[PDB]
From a paper:
Human bestrophin1 (hBest1) is a Ca2+-activated Cl− channel essential for Cl− transport in retinal pigment epithelium (RPE). Although the structure of hBest1 is still unsolved, two Best1 homolog structures, one from bacteria Klebsiella pneumoniae (KpBest) and the other from chicken (cBest1), have been previously reported. Overall, the channel is a pentameric assembly with a single ion-conducting pathway, which varies in diameter along its length and is constrained at two narrow points: a “neck” contributed by three residues (I62/I66/F70 in KpBest and I76/F80/F84 in hBest1/cBest1) on a transmembrane helix, and an “aperture” formed by a single residue (I180 in KpBest1, I205 in hBest1, and V205 in cBest1) on a cytosolic helix. Here, by electrophysiological and structural analyses, we show that the neck and aperture in hBest1 are both indispensable Ca2+-dependent gates, and their dysregulated opening by rationally designed or patient-derived mutations causes Ca2+-independent leak and elevates Ca2+-dependent channel activity.
Moreover, the equivalent KpBest mutants (W16A, G18A, S19A, L259A, P262A, G264A, and D269A) all showed an overall similar structure to that of WT KpBest. Interestingly, the KpBest P262A, G264A, and D269A mutants show no Zn2+ in the corresponding sites.
Residue numbers in the entry:
A (entry chain A): 22 to 294
B (entry chain E), E (entry chain B): 22 to 290
C (entry chain C): 23 to 291
D (entry chain D): 22 to 289
Write the structure that this text describes.
Amino acid sequence: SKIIFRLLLNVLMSIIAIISYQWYEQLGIHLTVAPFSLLGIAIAIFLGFRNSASYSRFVEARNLWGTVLIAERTLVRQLRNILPAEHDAHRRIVSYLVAFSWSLKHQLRKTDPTADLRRLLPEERVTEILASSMPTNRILLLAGNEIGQLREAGKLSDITYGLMDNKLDELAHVLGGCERLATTPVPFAYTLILQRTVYLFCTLLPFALVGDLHYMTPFVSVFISYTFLSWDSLAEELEDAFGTAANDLPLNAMCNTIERNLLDMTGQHPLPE
Amino acid sequence: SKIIFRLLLNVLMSIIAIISYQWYEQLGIHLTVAPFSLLGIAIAIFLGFRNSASYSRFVEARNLWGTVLIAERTLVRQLRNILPAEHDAHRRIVSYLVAFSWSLKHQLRKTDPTADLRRLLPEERVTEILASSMPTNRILLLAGNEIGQLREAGKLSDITYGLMDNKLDELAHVLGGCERLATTPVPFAYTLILQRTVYLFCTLLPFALVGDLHYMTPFVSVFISYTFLSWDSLAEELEDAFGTAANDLPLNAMCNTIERNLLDMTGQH
Amino acid sequence: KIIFRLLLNVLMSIIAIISYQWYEQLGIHLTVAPFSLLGIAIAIFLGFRNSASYSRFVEARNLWGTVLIAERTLVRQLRNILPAEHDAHRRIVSYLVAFSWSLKHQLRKTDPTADLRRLLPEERVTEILASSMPTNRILLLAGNEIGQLREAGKLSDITYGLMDNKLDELAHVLGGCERLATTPVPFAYTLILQRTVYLFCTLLPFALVGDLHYMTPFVSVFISYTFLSWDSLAEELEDAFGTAANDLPLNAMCNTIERNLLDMTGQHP
Amino acid sequence: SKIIFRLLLNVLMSIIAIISYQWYEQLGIHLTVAPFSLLGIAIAIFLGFRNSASYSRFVEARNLWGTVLIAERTLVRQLRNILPAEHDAHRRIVSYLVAFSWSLKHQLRKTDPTADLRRLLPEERVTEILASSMPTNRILLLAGNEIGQLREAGKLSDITYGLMDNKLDELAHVLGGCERLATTPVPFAYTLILQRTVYLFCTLLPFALVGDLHYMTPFVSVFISYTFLSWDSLAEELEDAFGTAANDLPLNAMCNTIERNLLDMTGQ
Amino acid sequence: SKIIFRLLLNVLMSIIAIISYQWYEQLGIHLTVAPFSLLGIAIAIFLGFRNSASYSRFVEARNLWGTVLIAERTLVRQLRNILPAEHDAHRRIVSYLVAFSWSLKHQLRKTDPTADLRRLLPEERVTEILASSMPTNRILLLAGNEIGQLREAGKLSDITYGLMDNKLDELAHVLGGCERLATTPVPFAYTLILQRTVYLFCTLLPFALVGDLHYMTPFVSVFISYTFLSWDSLAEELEDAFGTAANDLPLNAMCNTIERNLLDMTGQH
Ligand SMILES: [Cl-]
Ligand SMILES: [Cl-]
Ligand SMILES: [Cl-]
Ligand SMILES: [Cl-]
Ligand SMILES: [Cl-]
Ligand SMILES: [Cl-]
Ligand SMILES: [Cl-]
Ligand SMILES: [Cl-]
Ligand SMILES: [Cl-]
Ligand SMILES: [Cl-]
Ligand SMILES: [Zn+2]
Ligand SMILES: [Zn+2]
Ligand SMILES: [Zn+2]
Ligand SMILES: [Zn+2]
Ligand SMILES: [Zn+2]
Ligand SMILES: [Zn+2]
Ligand SMILES: [Zn+2]
Ligand SMILES: [Zn+2]
Ligand SMILES: [Zn+2]
Ligand SMILES: [Zn+2]
Ligand SMILES: [Zn+2]
Ligand SMILES: [Zn+2]
Ligand SMILES: [Zn+2]
Ligand SMILES: [Zn+2]
């Protein structure tokens, strides 16, 4: 945590305010609580509204990765109920849906997806995915091909295809939502204005409190600084949700759960009497 | 009250603040209202936003369990309307749908679902559901198999199947919603950090209010503490509705309400 | 209703005026600054409470709005697809009107027998009252009317599906309305704030008397009026469907629904 | 602009507080800023939440009238794409949909739609619509008749009818939405509490401020009054959210845009 | 940023406050921190609510532009799945959809769209687009005609047409949503009330702050003037997300992303 260094600096800023208190009126400088109370309340309001915006983006990030689990379950679930005999079709579609989860993971984590794609799909398909400028959207097209080919075979009617097509439409809203959160953040000015005001408020606070507290200055100033800094750092963990930090989503575990889910519903060996 | 231990501790610290006030001039330590007022208003704003997020989680929690009630009612309604003669199918689907509700209750609470599943389903399926790592999802698959088998027999058309399949999707959106809302740790320790900030503000407050109130310190300081601690403990309850430390009554009720409703529709009681 | 405490607030202020000459005699200090910090905190918590209460009232009004929308569109679809089947029209409308009235009685926790016998044959009223939830039975009986027209050959599976969607939407309303009635916003919400504001407003003139002297009862009743009126509005918005001053006129709403559905069929009330 | 008359009243109430300040010690009355700070902050919190609720109902009114534009554009678009030859059908439905837009406007504004209805529709239909107690709903039923009769002619299938029916369902949600906003206003308590409080706070404010500010009282008190009254008046206009005021929705401009769009798509 | 000018002018106003403080009791002028504190907190609350509503407009504008990508991705995807042989049909529809994004961008910015329309579509169609009052809605009708004529031949059934029809309905919701934000912004009172109040508070702030701070008056007044004006400017920027400012949407880059998505490898699959 980088918060603890700021707390140690707040103690140092408090002690230098205590010893230099003699040279205050000799220069003619005064700092009271009431002007800093107005500034602090203003900052406490603005931080609250920013953290609300940061939480709302984190909820949206959590919701979209929840939908990957829902849409892929229901698509395999529909496949098992409508076409219970097409087991060769199942394992092809399943492998694409697992691959979609892993490729979406690596797209948000800015990492190479080649290892996971080769683990799940044949080399003719991995080359096709990597050729595309948008690799994860290619997978949905290739998964869409498999549902389309079953409709082309006559195994799926236009109604049963339409029921399965809507699940792929849900999956497209996941990818488009995840890309939108990754590319467009909370406008940088939000974090730039507040982080500047908080740090400058926390350092100038013991100088404003030294006249009222005298010797209790380091104990109180830290306790006020801690409240304003913890709330500021809370938003700095929620805004970026697709990284590898403490509050950031465990996407490795989530993709493992999806892989476990889709190989739980399938994998049941057909025709053992 | 649960927090009444900390309320009497606040009065205990107030009496300490009165007697030790004589020693304050020996080190040159002073505590005015204005520094603790700025901190107090700041905490009050931060508790307001946190409680709003806690309420937001609670409303969505009840909405999902409302959809369990809605989707299962409308699935049984569609079965009676489209296929009025197929009572053998009715009994099986209702058995699975109620088994979905109870298994979801035991999944959110992390409790054993074996006793409830054995009551509603035969042992061939109970072992199959318990073998799966996702038991509630397995029930939806088996419920989907019942709708799917009526389609393959020729009794359900592709459109009438589609109407019933959408109701199974609603329950699957709930399961995925409930799984997400229970297994998310939205803070690292900030649910405890903000709780600790309230605690230490409450205990240091009588030392700050002793100069302005003297003997009225235990009266006013406990009344400020009460308003802050009650609002903090309220957000603690609303954040985890599907908790082991949370009330079991609203979750056990809606599982019985759905069982009572589905048995009434088919005409069994 | 709030005037009973507004007169009590002036009476408590009179006590604060006469006892001010005994303040330093008893040895008590009460400054404005600690009560300012507490009062701002309460104002924040009431601000979030009233906002949460407003969202309940909006959702409750929206659900009853959807009854009027869904039933209009169901009759509209019946007239466009099957213009000849007026025997179907009159039966379904009488069910949809009965659903609205039984929804009113369910939320109010009252007997619906007086309104059900007015609209429906006696055998159906006995069947409706037999069920655990009367409204869910009506939607099932209205669904059977659409279902029997599908079995006759007059409605295809597609045209059944369009009419079925509105019956699904009405069941989402029923599940929504039941949720807002059966699950109130947790116990503590009113237990904290209502009693906190009462104890704040009565103990405030004791703190105000040091700075205001004889203007104490005039300014204390000002702050009390603003705090209590915001408190009372939030309780009127939370609850709900009943017979309070600021609540939904459900008797007038059900009459508007009945008049709309009779007007579309070519009938006069 | 009710504010400018009230701002001059506040300066006039401030000068009373200055001249009667010599009488304060005689009556035994002392007024500090600190209790009025507590009250004013509370008012500012409650005004902030009310204005938030008022803006939310304005956005909802904007979104519903946005849906009028979208659902009617798409229904005409669906008609041209499925049935490119049936122009006799187009002329009636477009005129019905435009009549829906104007009838919804006149129902919300509480004005007579007779002049607009006879401008678009034949006398056999206008007299039938005006006969109905819900004239905007009557248009949706007659618009549904045109889609329904195209289905019964064998020109529209059950599938293509269902795609068009969803748009009529979407416009019916708007009608029920707009009626909900009109018949049920923002609880009159919100206006009864705050407006009484804001006016009484601003009037009583210089009497507490005169003890600390003296001759700067009419400058400071009028600037606090301006902030509190401007925010209250803004929330008042957003609460409606319709009507004839300048701050409200330009519904005449919107209905003409809908009328122009549907006549553009048909080539008229 | 125009704040840097108003920040430097705020320091100059603070120098006037320092030199004139001696003459305060001579001129008969008293200015304390407490009334300006009450005013400043009130402004900070109203700025907090405005900035939140401003951000909500920015989010909804981004969400609609996100939908442009998603709805067009799937519309081409469905064409690449249902009709994989119709390659000449693909390139015609794709070109309309790329033209839809660019024509939307130029409509919201109020600039000439002819330069980008010629780049993507034939001259017989570009003139038909420019002839219409709403050029972006005309493109949806022209792209819809391509889907409609494939149904006319019998290549698409009524069901598979409906799947593609829903996607063009989704794009029309973006068109109406983006117009709603652009044609009418926030009420003009919102901007004119706050921008008058914020700076007139900031200029009159050092005159009230001089009594407590003396020589530190320009340091603290520029701090508060920074925090209040930076929040007002951010709110003013985000309200018009379709403008050409720093915190606004990069709509030029977004349309290039849509173009590269729909033309994945010159329209191949
Ligand atoms: Cl398989
Ligand atoms: Cl049965
Ligand atoms: Cl509807
Ligand atoms: Cl009829
Ligand atoms: Cl639409
Ligand atoms: Cl025409
Ligand atoms: Cl035409
Ligand atoms: Cl889509
Ligand atoms: Cl191509
Ligand atoms: Cl000086
Ligand atoms: Zn299989
Ligand atoms: Zn979509
Ligand atoms: Zn049965
Ligand atoms: Zn789904
Ligand atoms: Zn004493
Ligand atoms: Zn509807
Ligand atoms: Zn009839
Ligand atoms: Zn449903
Ligand atoms: Zn035409
Ligand atoms: Zn003709
Ligand atoms: Zn007339
Ligand atoms: Zn192609
Ligand atoms: Zn639509
Ligand atoms: Zn000086």
